[PDB]
Structures are given as C-alpha cells and as structure tokens.
C-alpha cells in the first residue's frame, strides 16, 4: 500500500540520520561531518534493501527512496572524502581497520546507485514506470561526483585499488581480487551516464535534464579534465600495460575493454589532428551562408505578394493550365516545378536497431564533440600512450578469451569488441599517414590468424540469424582489417591471410551484402559502399578477377547505389567520389551500359547538377558533369539505333530468353 | 556606376519606336504582367552589358539586386469621381493635394519555420496573402505531422504606407464639397510626401472584398477601392 511504501521510505530516512552528522560544538563554520554508530548495520541493511528486496521484486522503488533522501550526495561522498583526506595527511607525514571497513562499504553503494539502466519487455511495470525519473537522478549523480573538491572522491576509489596492487599476486585471495574488479567497474558507470532518451507508450500519435543540470556539467570534455587532475589516467595506463605479468587477466580485462569503448565512442579521429584559425574558418563559413542567401534571393520576386498577376500555359493538343505568381511569367522551369508541387498525395513509406547506447551504429557521426586545448592534448597523450603501450597485449588476451567463449556471448560484448578494434586500427593508420615518428607495428596484433577468424565468425553468425546490429558493427570491423592489409602489402604471411580471407565462401557473403542494404537506414548503406570499394580495390592489386566483378553487377546493387545517392544533401564530399568511382566501373570498364538506362537516375542528375544542388566549385561537379556528358552520348547512340528504348526507359529490364539478350546489348 | 535600382520611363517613347506601338496599349490593359516582364528584361540587360563588354563589376552584386521600371506620362488625367467599374485593374493618372500619411506598416514577404522536435528549418514564399505552411516536417527521418512552427522575428518584411489624396477644387461639382481617395505605396516611395503637397500620380486602380465579421469567411457585396501607385511626380 501507499502507507507501507512511505513506511519503508521513513525507515530509510531514519537510517539516513542514524548514520551520523557534523559537529555543532565545532565553531568551525562549517566543519566536516562526524560519525554515528550502528552504522555498519545501517550500510548493511541498505545493501539488503537493494539486493534482498528491490531486486527480488524488480522495482527501483528503493532507489527512488534513497534519491528522495539524497543519501549519495549528502553522506557517502563526505564519509569517503574524509577517510581519503585523513589517510592522505597521515601518508604525508610518513580500530583504524574499522575506518577502512566503512570506506569499502560506502564505495560499493556508489557503484550500485550509479549502475546503468536497461529496459525490456520482461522488466516489471514498476521499473518501466520509474525509468524516466531515475535517469534524471543519475544525471545529478554524475555532476555531483565530478564536482566535489574538483572531483576528489575519485582519489579514494584508486587508493582502495592501491591496497590490492600492493602485495604479490601469489598471495591474492578471491575476495581480494574483487576489489580490483570493483574499482574499474566504478569508472565505467561514471563515463556511461549521459543525457536521457525519451520514451513513450504508443497509444496515440499526438528535454529531460532537471533544473539543476546543464550540458557543460555532463559533457565528455568535463570528464577528461576531472580524471586528469584526480590522477586516473596514470592508473589505467600502468594497470593495462603491465597486464601480461601475472595480474590474473580474467578479472580485469573485460571491464577494461568497456572503459576504452565508453570514451572512444563519440570522437572522430580527424578532430584530434588539425589537418585566429577559428575566426578565419568562421568568416569562410559566413561566405557559405551568403551563398545560401543568394540562392533564396534568386527565387524571390521584386514587387510585393499582392501585386501578382496570373499565367496560363497551353500544352500540345491546345489544353491549358493556370499558375500564379510573378516569377512563373518568365521561368518555365519554375512554373513546371510549381505546377506539380501543389498536388496533395505522397506515397506512405517503410522503415532496424534497438537495445543499446548511442554510438556510430545508429547516429549521424558528422557532428563532433568539443575540447579545450589542455583537454585535447591530454586526451591525445592518453590514447597515444595507450596505443604505444597497451593495445597488442590487451587485444591478444581479450581475443583468445572469446574464441573459447563465443557461444555464450551477448549482443553488447559483440558490439563492444567490434568497435574497439575499429577505432584503434583506424586512428593508428591515420597517425602514421601523417608522420614518420608513428609506425604501424604498434597495432600489428590485429592481423594474426586467430583474431581474423574471430571477426569473420562474428560477421558470419550475425548475418545468418538476421541480427542486423551486430551485422552492422561486424561490417565496420571487417572493413578496417582489409584497409590495414592494403597498407601492409604496400611495404609474406599477409598474402596467406588474404588467400584465406578470399576463399569462395566469403566472396559469396561479401557479394551478397549490398543487395539487402536497400531497405535499411542511411548508415547501413554507407557501410556497404565503403566496404565494397575496399574489397574490390584489394583484388585489383592481387594482379579470378573477372569472375568476381561479374558477381557484383546486377539490378539490386544498382538500386541500392541510387537510393543512397539521392540523399546527397546530407552526405560528405568523399562518399560521392566513391559512388561515381563505381559507376565508372560499371559503365566504362565493364561495358554493362544497360543497367543505368533507368529513369530515376536521369531525374537525379538534373537535381544534383542544377544550380540547386552541388556547389558550382566543389570538386563533385568535375566528376558529375564529366560523367553525364558521356552518359548522354551513349544514350543518344542507343536510342537512334533502336527506338523501342523510349518505352524501355521507364521500366526494369526484361528477363525473357529470346528477346532479352538483344535487349541488354 | 551610380549604384541605383529604378528607371523612369515616359510611355510616349513606346509609340515612337515601330516595334512597340501595340505594347503601349497592352501596358494600359494588363499592367501587373507587363510591368513584371519589363523588370526581368532590364535586369538581364544589365547583366549582359558587363559580361559582353567584359567589365570588372561583380556579377554577384548585380544578380543580388532588384531592378524596377516606373512608367509615367501615360495619357490624359482622369477625374476622381469619374472612375467606373470598367476601369478595374487598368492604369490610371490622378492630380490632387495630399492631406495626411499614416506611419510605416510592416508587410510580410517570407515566412520562417522551425521543427519543434528535430530543429530542421524551412523558408517559405508568401503569395496572395496566404502562408503555405507544410503538412509534415520534411526531414526524412522526422516525417511527423504538426511538427513545424513559425518564428516571427526571423521572417522577412517590407515597408507599406497609405496616403490620403484630396480632389483639387478645379473638378468639384456645382454646389458641392471635394472628395478624397486613398493611395497604397511601397518600398522606395514610402516617406516621399508631406501634408499640403501637390502631386500627380500613376498606378493601377484596384478593388477588393471586405469581411462581414472577423470570425468567418462571409464577404460583403460592396467592394472597397483604392490606387496602387508605381510613380509620383
């Protein structure tokens, strides 16, 4: 009942004072807090309220109670920070166990309250009710923990680790090893808490930061500054790099994978390399704004909106139409477009991924996140030392785990592994592209045979069961491996690895993959394109080839390419270079001209080539106009030789045996 | 070379040149279309001069500007009381004295929309006084109904003013008092004229309906009339 609920809330509130309090003799305005008794029992019973009740009833009500009484912010942080600062001063000089006991048990609650949140069709209605609100409260937690004394609780958590670093692994009991798992398990949460995702019941078709929270409190930029001052990055670096020497790998190296995922996520590598500067580029951007303004002006009438006359347009067969406005009098292109634009209907439309936190897989990544200069250089230093120090030893362990455990996996661990591989391999390639001090040997553990098998196997199994999110990530990982191979061939075993990578079975898979992309989201198709470009380019420099290229060329691939190309207002300068490379391959080299004589391509080239779309001076117009010229020349030749193609141009090609051969050629 | 945008034109020159003898009549009978044609002719000619004579002037600057013709000396002046319903939408010429001018009124020309959920934006063209609001948000992944909304202070506006013109005593009927007519004037010509000024004008003689109440589309049978000036002298 409501009264039983508030009785438990009141029980918690009383426990929220039995804990202790600051001293009003002190005349120190204010002092720190001061300590209660039964407090062991207080902490333990709170732990029981989580584990023995809320978990067993699947509620999150208990968390709502502790959030009501602000336990984290009010007691746990000063209890820990006082323990830390006391022991720090004692170390400067250079029952006490009971104090240390309290330090352990306060931290374990911090891990529990900030643990990240999952919702399914098997979660209770209680949890589904409370999801949106507890998100707000966890955001408050992240801000607070990073703020206190400029984040000094984070020194307490690592000092706890330092006690268990201390003495030889040969001594270290299972209970002892849990501390070293626990500490790293904390930092994962502090990075993982981020602004909410809005969710509603789909009964009818019709921000969540609380008043005390703002973006600069919560941004990844902040977290960098906070960890650096409070001495975390040294701990993650030392701990990962000596990992091979007999720290029991089993307890550390998955939590330590999740950290690296959880703050590589949302960085584009180009933002870490530069390739008054801000003001200069701002001025240039204002020039671009002026061009857009000019485009609007070129469609704007001189005289006002009620001056306008009326226009009539007569067709062949003497039938007439009517359009209004003063620009229609002079511009037939505009009149024709304006005529169709009035018409009401649009055909309604069809729509791939859920269950996991925001990442490259389901967001448009043409949108950076933003760094102070000190933060930029500190972050660059952290991951550069990580790569030069830790990467091979980490990947070798985590991969030779997962080969023995693949059957037992869960979707998240698959998507973590495939987006840790991808990031670090790409970033190193870019860094050594830039400079000679860097080298490729640092990432060279990715190529050895076991990992290649494992990325292959993940992609295989994901594709067969029609799990499209793992398939998407696996596509991204398998792209980079191929990219790295072409690098190393441009310098023995690598050719053996290629020959095994391009057994016939895999060519069947990698040929299959663009065909299904037509239905799905804009990123999926983009992954398919970039993988295809790489896949063909390697086999070009193998010297088989004619068998493989004919395997790619057919109607359902071309359909995907156009369906992707028409959203060009959103895409990069580089991706369109890739698409026209492929059309050059289909049209000129392979001489399979009949695929592209289809009408929705001819519309597209007008839009994109018009004064509407692609800029008059972008590099894209060089490629596009050089393509269309050749297109229309060959089309002219075909149409005059055989006039039936006028009715051909609307429809798909015709698959009958007796007429179809002459049709295609 | 003076950086200016309007060209005077006395209509008698259209009668002197043989190829435009009929264009003179078409101007009086169809002003709204013919004047627009003349505007887009002048702008193109200005561009042609700099590109043909290959001069140093910025093509973008000329493309950005609006150019307008202002015809005048069209024919005999017409008595204010003798305008009849067969003169609607034809060019007229009037003489008179200025009584008063209202302050400048902002007139909207372009509307600005923003999506409430995904922050997509669209600029829309105003014609015939009606805002062509979109049915759904046009961003592909945010194809939602009622999702766009108007932002007043990011629209674009233009100046309108109303001038009250009185009949000159030379035309008043015997034993009667002079009448007056209202002139609508835009952009360049807005603040030109003061109380007590004596002028001659040229503009289309227009008429429009008026509503019975502000709640509903019900119109009255009598129509309001006014003059839409394109030149003042």
């Amino acid at each position: 009942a409501d009264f039983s609920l508030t009785v438990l809330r009141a029980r918690i509130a009383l426990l929220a004072t039995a804990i202790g309090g600051p001293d009003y003799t002190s005349q120190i305005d204010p002092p720190p807090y001061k300590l209660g008794d039964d407090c062991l029992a207080c902490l333990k019973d709170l732990k029981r309220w989580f584990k023995l009740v809320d978990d067993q009833q699947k509620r999150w009500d208990v968390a709502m109670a502790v959030a009501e009484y602000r336990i984290l912010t009010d007691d746990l942080l000063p209890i820990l920070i006082d323990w830390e600062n006391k022991c720090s001063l004692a170390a400067k000089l250079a029952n006490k166990a009971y104090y240390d006991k309290i330090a352990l048990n306060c931290l374990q609650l911090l891990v529990l309250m900030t643990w990240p949140l999952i919702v399914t069709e098997q979660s209770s209605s209680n949890q589904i009710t409370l999801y949106g609100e507890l998100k707000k409260h966890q955001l408050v937690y992240k801000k607070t923990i990073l703020s206190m004394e400029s984040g000094k609780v984070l020194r307490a958590a690592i000092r706890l680790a330092l006690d268990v670093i201390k003495i030889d692994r040969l001594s270290r009991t299972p209970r002892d090893n849990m501390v070293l798992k626990l500490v790293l398990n904390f930092f994962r949460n502090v990075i993982a808490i981020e602004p909410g995702e809005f969710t509603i019941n789909t009964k009818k078709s019709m921000d969540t930061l609380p008043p005390n929270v703002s973006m600069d409190d919560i941004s990844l930029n902040t977290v960098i500054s906070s960890f650096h001052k409070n001495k975390v990055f040294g701990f993650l670096l030392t701990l990962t790099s000596s990992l091979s020497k007999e720290f029991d790998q089993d307890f550390i190296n998955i939590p330590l994978l999740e950290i690296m995922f959880y703050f590589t996520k949302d960085v584009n590598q180009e933002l870490l390399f530069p390739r008054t500067s801000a003001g200069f580029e701002l001025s240039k951007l204002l020039q671009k704004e002026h061009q857009m303004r000019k485009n609007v002006i070129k469609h704007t009438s001189a005289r006002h909106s009620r001056f306008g006359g009326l226009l009539s347009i007569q067709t062949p067969d003497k039938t007439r139409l009517t359009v209004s406005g003063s620009q229609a009098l002079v511009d037939e292109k505009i009149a024709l477009q304006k005529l169709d634009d009035s018409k009401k209907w649009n055909k309604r439309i069809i729509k791939a991924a859920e269950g996991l936190p925001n990442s490259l897989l389901n967001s448009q990544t043409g949108k950076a996140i933003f760094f102070t200069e000190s933060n930029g250089k500190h972050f660059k230093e952290f991951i550069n030392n990580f790569i030069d120090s830790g990467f091979n030893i980490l990947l070798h362990s985590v991969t030779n785990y997962f080969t023995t455990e693949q059957d037992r996996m869960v979707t998240l661990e698959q998507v973590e592994y495939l987006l840790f591989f991808a990031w670090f391999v790409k970033y190193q390639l870019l860094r050594s592209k830039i400079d000679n001090s860097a080298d490729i040997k640092q990432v060279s553990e990715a190529l050895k045979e076991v990992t290649f098998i494992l990325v292959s196997s993940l992609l295989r199994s994901a594709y067969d069961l029609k799990n499209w999110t793992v398939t998407h990530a696996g596509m991204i990982a398998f792209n980079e491996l191929l990219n790295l191979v072409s690098r190393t061939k441009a310098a023995t075993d690598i050719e053996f690895i290629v020959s095994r990578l391009f057994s016939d079975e895999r060519i069947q898979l990698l040929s299959n993959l663009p065909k299904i992309g037509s239905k799905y989201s804009l990123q999926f198709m983009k992954s398919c394109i970039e993988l295809t470009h790489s896949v063909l380019k390697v086999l070009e420099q193998y010297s088989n080839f004619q068998k493989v290229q004919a395997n790619y060329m057919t109607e359902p691939v071309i359909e995907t390419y156009i369906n992707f190309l028409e959203r060009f207002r959103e895409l990069e300068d580089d991706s369109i270079k890739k698409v026209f490379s492929f059309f050059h391959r289909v049209f000129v080299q392979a001489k399979e001209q009949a695929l592209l004589f289809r009408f929705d391509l001819i519309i597209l080239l007008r839009e994109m080539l018009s004064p509407d779309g692609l800029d008059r001076m972008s590099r894209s117009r060089k490629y596009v106009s050089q393509f269309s010229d050749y297109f229309l020349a060959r089309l002219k030749k075909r149409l005059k030789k055989s006039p039936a193609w006028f009715v051909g141009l609307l429809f798909p090609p015709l698959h009958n045996s007796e007429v179809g051969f002459y049709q295609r050629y | 070379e003076l950086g200016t945008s309007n060209l005077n034109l006395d209509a008698r020159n259209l009668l002197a040149y043989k190829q435009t003898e009929d264009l003179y009549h078409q101007l009086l009978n169809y002003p709204q279309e013919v004047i627009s044609i003349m505007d887009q002719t002048i702008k193109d000619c200005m561009v042609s001069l700099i590109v043909d004579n290959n001069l140093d002037y910025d093509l973008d600057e000329i493309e950005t500007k609006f150019y307008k013709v202002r015809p005048y000396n069209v024919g005999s002046c017409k008595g204010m009381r003798e305008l009849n319903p067969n003169d609607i939408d034809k060019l007229i010429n009037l003489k008179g004295l200025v009584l008063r001018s209202t302050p400048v009124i902002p007139d909207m020309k372009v509307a600005f929309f923003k999506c409430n959920v995904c922050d997509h934006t669209m600029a829309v063209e105003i014609d015939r006084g009606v805002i062509q609001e979109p049915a759904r948000c046009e961003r592909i992944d945010c194809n939602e109904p009622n999702s766009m909304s108007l932002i007043h202070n990011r629209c674009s506006f233009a100046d309108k003013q109303v001038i009250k013109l009185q009949e000159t005593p030379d035309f008043v009927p015997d034993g009667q008092t002079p009448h007056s007519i209202s002139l609508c004037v835009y952009d360049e010509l807005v603040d030109s004229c003061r109380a007590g000024d004596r002028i001659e004008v040229t503009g289309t003689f227009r008429s429009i309906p008026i509503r019975a109440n502000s709640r509903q589309r019900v119109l009255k049978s009598l129509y309001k009339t006014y003059v839409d000036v394109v030149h003042v002298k």
């Binding site: 809005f198 969710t199 509603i200 019941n201 | 995904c118």
Partner: peptide, 11 residues
C-alpha cells in the same frame, strides 16, 4: 505495453 523510444530524435 507498446513502449517506444524516439530513436530518430538526433537534432
């Protein structure tokens, strides 16, 4: 219940 996230929300 037909719970659903605003997966498309990215501004």
């Amino acid at each position: 219940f037909k719970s659903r996230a605003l997966n498309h929300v990215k501004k």
